[PDB]
Design an enzyme around this catalytic site. Structure first.
Site, PDB file in Angstrom:
ATOM      1  N   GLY A   1       8.308   3.612   0.050  1.00 21.17           N
ATOM      2  CA  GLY A   1       9.217   4.711  -0.275  1.00 21.17           C
ATOM      3  C   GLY A   1      10.560   4.673   0.418  1.00 21.17           C
ATOM      4  O   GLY A   1      11.293   3.700   0.303  1.00 21.17           O
ATOM      5  N   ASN A   2      10.852   5.741   1.159  1.00 19.88           N
ATOM      6  CA  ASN A   2      12.200   6.030   1.686  1.00 19.88           C
ATOM      7  C   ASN A   2      12.558   5.093   2.865  1.00 19.88           C
ATOM      8  O   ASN A   2      13.542   4.328   2.818  1.00 19.88           O
ATOM      9  CB  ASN A   2      12.321   7.534   2.121  1.00 19.88           C
ATOM     10  N   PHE A   3      11.730   5.205   3.910  1.00 18.28           N
ATOM     11  CA  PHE A   3      11.741   4.382   5.142  1.00 18.28           C
ATOM     12  C   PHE A   3      11.718   2.833   4.967  1.00 18.28           C
ATOM     13  O   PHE A   3      12.314   2.079   5.753  1.00 18.28           O
ATOM     14  CB  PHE A   3      10.519   4.794   6.004  1.00 18.28           C
TER      15      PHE A   3
ATOM     16  N   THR B   1       8.419   0.129   3.569  1.00 14.85           N
ATOM     17  CA  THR B   1       7.208  -0.142   2.818  1.00 14.85           C
ATOM     18  C   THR B   1       5.979  -0.247   3.713  1.00 14.85           C
ATOM     19  O   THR B   1       6.090  -0.412   4.933  1.00 14.85           O
ATOM     20  CB  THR B   1       7.343  -1.469   2.031  1.00 14.85           C
TER      21      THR B   1
ATOM     22  N   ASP C   1       1.820  17.623   5.812  1.00 15.79           N
ATOM     23  CA  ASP C   1       1.905  16.820   4.568  1.00 15.79           C
ATOM     24  C   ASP C   1       0.536  16.650   3.929  1.00 15.79           C
ATOM     25  O   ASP C   1       0.212  15.638   3.368  1.00 15.79           O
ATOM     26  CB  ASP C   1       2.575  15.461   4.802  1.00 15.79           C
TER      27      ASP C   1
ATOM     28  N   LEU D   1       0.831  -1.188   0.000  1.00 10.98           N
ATOM     29  CA  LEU D   1       0.000   0.000   0.000  1.00 10.98           C
ATOM     30  C   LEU D   1       0.869   1.243   0.000  1.00 10.98           C
ATOM     31  O   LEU D   1       0.934   1.955   0.988  1.00 10.98           O
ATOM     32  CB  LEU D   1      -0.901  -0.001   1.234  1.00 10.98           C
TER      33      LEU D   1
HETATM   34  C1  LIG Z   1      -2.676   3.980   6.772  1.00  9.66           C
HETATM   35  C2  LIG Z   1      -1.600   4.060   5.887  1.00  9.66           C
HETATM   36  C3  LIG Z   1      -1.744   3.627   4.580  1.00  9.66           C
HETATM   37  C4  LIG Z   1      -0.587   3.738   3.622  1.00  9.66           C
HETATM   38  C5  LIG Z   1      -0.736   5.014   2.768  1.00  9.66           C
HETATM   39  C6  LIG Z   1      -0.429   6.226   3.600  1.00  9.66           C
HETATM   40  C7  LIG Z   1      -0.579   7.459   2.726  1.00  9.66           C
HETATM   41  O1  LIG Z   1       0.312   7.371   1.559  1.00  9.66           O
HETATM   42  C8  LIG Z   1       0.014   6.240   0.757  1.00  9.66           C
HETATM   43  C9  LIG Z   1       0.219   4.977   1.582  1.00  9.66           C
HETATM   44  N1  LIG Z   1      -2.987   3.098   4.138  1.00  9.66           N
HETATM   45  N2  LIG Z   1      -3.355   2.633   3.039  1.00  9.66           N
HETATM   46  C10 LIG Z   1      -4.632   2.245   3.131  1.00  9.66           C
HETATM   47  N3  LIG Z   1      -5.412   1.718   2.122  1.00  9.66           N
HETATM   48  C11 LIG Z   1      -4.945   1.568   0.862  1.00  9.66           C
HETATM   49  C12 LIG Z   1      -5.644   0.759  -0.031  1.00  9.66           C
HETATM   50  C13 LIG Z   1      -5.160   0.572  -1.329  1.00  9.66           C
HETATM   51  C14 LIG Z   1      -4.003   1.213  -1.736  1.00  9.66           C
HETATM   52  C15 LIG Z   1      -3.312   1.225  -2.918  1.00  9.66           C
HETATM   53  N4  LIG Z   1      -3.634   0.541  -4.031  1.00  9.66           N
HETATM   54  C16 LIG Z   1      -3.067   0.913  -5.341  1.00  9.66           C
HETATM   55  C17 LIG Z   1      -3.600  -0.062  -6.424  1.00  9.66           C
HETATM   56  C18 LIG Z   1      -3.198   0.439  -7.828  1.00  9.66           C
HETATM   57  O2  LIG Z   1      -3.695   1.809  -8.048  1.00  9.66           O
HETATM   58  C19 LIG Z   1      -3.048   2.707  -7.134  1.00  9.66           C
HETATM   59  C20 LIG Z   1      -3.486   2.364  -5.690  1.00  9.66           C
HETATM   60  N5  LIG Z   1      -2.243   2.036  -2.753  1.00  9.66           N
HETATM   61  N6  LIG Z   1      -2.237   2.491  -1.569  1.00  9.66           N
HETATM   62  C21 LIG Z   1      -3.319   2.014  -0.887  1.00  9.66           C
HETATM   63  C22 LIG Z   1      -3.780   2.213   0.433  1.00  9.66           C
HETATM   64  N7  LIG Z   1      -5.041   2.493   4.374  1.00  9.66           N
HETATM   65  C23 LIG Z   1      -4.039   3.020   5.014  1.00  9.66           C
HETATM   66  C24 LIG Z   1      -3.893   3.473   6.336  1.00  9.66           C
END
Ligand SMILES: c1cc(CC2CCOCC2)n2nc(Nc3ccc4c(NC5CCOCC5)n[nH]c4c3)nc2c1
EC number: 2.7.10.2
Length: 273
Positions: A21-23, A25, A131, A18
């Site tokens: 990056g830097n830190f 995953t 941010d 989800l």
């Molecule tokens: C806290 C932190 C994060 C990581 C976040 C913190 C803010 O920066 C981004 C990471 N998330 N991410 C989710 N739910 C989520 C679901 C699906 C995707 C997804 N699916 C890709 C599928 C292909 O097309 C692009 C999206 N990418 N990220 C997703 C995140 N919920 C949270 C809660």
């Protein structure tokens, strides 16, 4: 872009990332709570500095309680250090709108008003986000948004209403207000400027702001009186709000109370109809 404790045993990971990056995953998985399982997003460290960002970050989220603010579960030391957060199933706002170009204008007003409520609550809590960007707003449903990503956020000292960074670590400068860039002062109001840019991204169905330009040039454009133009489809009253968020004078720029209410009414004008 950029220029508390838990039984590891009670927790499963998936090869489903989800962002990252830097830190290190972020990965999907779930945690056995009191009776049921909670689906979660878990920030993992690629392993000294990182591990204190994570603890500051967790400590910030620990402190926040609001429906439009993403909820921490806790932390966990195992093969890596991990921050465990409740999963927003639909994910990043920008990537959503990018992929669903036909989400109605009213829907977009709904979601940004929700972010505004989240931010109104931070402002009241005397925390700065630092941010606030479409990429870090997360959809739980099509019609329910939460603010995520408090890795740079800060609790404000009781004597001051700004945080003074000392050293520009890697910064999302296109979202930053002029005071952040010049004087490194970050406040509730700085985050309002960011909200402005966030609104712009939203109404542009997740296009990147100031496309084609460096922070160098963005900073020249802002000093030259210049702002981003109204996105195709955006309602006049909303482009007026974006712009108002982009007031150069921090003193004169609106706070989140004001912004929240103005959005409240416009949504309710759109809703009623
Ligand atoms: C806290 C932190 C994060 C990581 C976040 C913190 C803010 O920066 C981004 C990471 N998330 N991410 C989710 N739910 C989520 C679901 C699906 C995707 C997804 N699916 C890709 C599928 C292909 O097309 C692009 C999206 N990418 N990220 C997703 C995140 N919920 C949270 C809660």
């Amino acid at each position: 872009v950029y220029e508390v404790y838990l039984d590891r045993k009670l927790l499963t990971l998936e090869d489903k990332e989800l962002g990252s990056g830097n830190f290190g995953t972020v990965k999907k998985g779930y945690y056995q709570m009191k009776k049921v399982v909670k689906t979660v997003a878990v920030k993992i460290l690629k392993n000294p500095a990182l591990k204190d960002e994570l603890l500051a970050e967790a400590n910030v989220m620990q402190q926040l309680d609001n429906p439009y603010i993403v909820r921490m579960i806790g932390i966990c030391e195992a093969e890596s250090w991990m921050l465990v957060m409740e999963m927003a199933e639909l994910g990043p706002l920008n990537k959503y709108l990018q992929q669903n170009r036909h989400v109605k204008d009213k829907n977009i007003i709904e979601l940004v008003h929700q972010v505004s409520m989240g931010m109104k609550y931070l402002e009241e809590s005397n925390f700065v986000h630092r941010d606030l960007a479409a990429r870090n707003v997360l959809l739980v449903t099509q019609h329910y948004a939460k603010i995520s990503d408090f890795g740079l956020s800060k609790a404000l000292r009781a004597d001051e209403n700004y945080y003074k960074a000392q050293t520009h670590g890697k910064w999302p400068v296109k979202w930053y207000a002029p005071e952040c860039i010049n004087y490194y002062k970050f406040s509730s109001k700085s985050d309002v400027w960011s909200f402005g840019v966030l609104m712009w991204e939203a109404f542009s169905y997740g296009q990147k702001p100031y496309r084609g330009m460096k922070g160098s040039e963005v900073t020249a454009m802002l000093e030259k009186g210049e702002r981003m133009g109204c996105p195709a489809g955006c309602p006049r009253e909303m482009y007026d709000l974006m712009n108002l968020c982009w007031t150069y004078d921090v003193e004169n720029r609106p706070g989140f109370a004001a912004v929240e209410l103005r959005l409240r009414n416009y949504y309710y004008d759109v809703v009623n109809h």
